[PDB]
């Protein structure tokens, strides 16, 4: 099977940033034993990167892969093998909150409406 893991973009980045902050490293910290266990032989992780749909579709592709691939470089440091783990930026794309926040105009208001669709996704087969 495949265990999912969603972290919130908020906590781990600063806005236009892939630099994670120590916030970031202690939720990544918490999570690598969850994913230390992985199959020595099957076992692969993929990390995705999303953001909202807010600003330029492909400066959000591009940033959402940079964050990516900064957890990437966390993780593999703290002991995850590079060859079992990679990186993709989806950018907007697959968003988690649909038409929800169609209606909502206001730019606070509407930031926290997204914020469901900020994240890193962390999927971990076998």
């Known amino acids: 099977?495949?265990?999912?893991?969603?972290?919130?973009?908020?906590?781990?980045?600063?806005?236009?940033?892939?630099?994670?902050?120590?916030?970031?490293?202690?939720?990544?910290?918490?999570?690598?034993?969850?994913?230390?266990?992985?199959?020595?032989?099957?076992?692969?992780?993929?990390?995705?990167?999303?953001?909202?749909?807010?600003?330029?579709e492909a400066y959000n592709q591009q940033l959402s892969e940079k964050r990516a691939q900064s957890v990437v470089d966390y993780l593999v440091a703290k002991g995850i093998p590079a060859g079992k783990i990679s990186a993709r930026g989806m950018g907007e794309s697959n968003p988690v909150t649909g038409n929800t926040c169609d209606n909502v105009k206001a730019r606070a208001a509407l930031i926290d409406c997204l914020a469901p669709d900020r994240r890193v996704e962390i999927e971990v087969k076998g």
């Open 1 to 56: 099977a495949t265990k999912h893991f969603t972290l919130k973009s908020d906590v781990l980045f600063n806005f236009n940033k892939a630099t994670l902050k120590p916030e970031g490293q202690q939720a990544l910290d918490q999570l690598y034993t969850q994913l230390s266990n992985m199959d020595p032989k099957d076992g692969s992780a993929v990390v995705l990167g999303y953001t909202d749909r807010i600003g330029s």
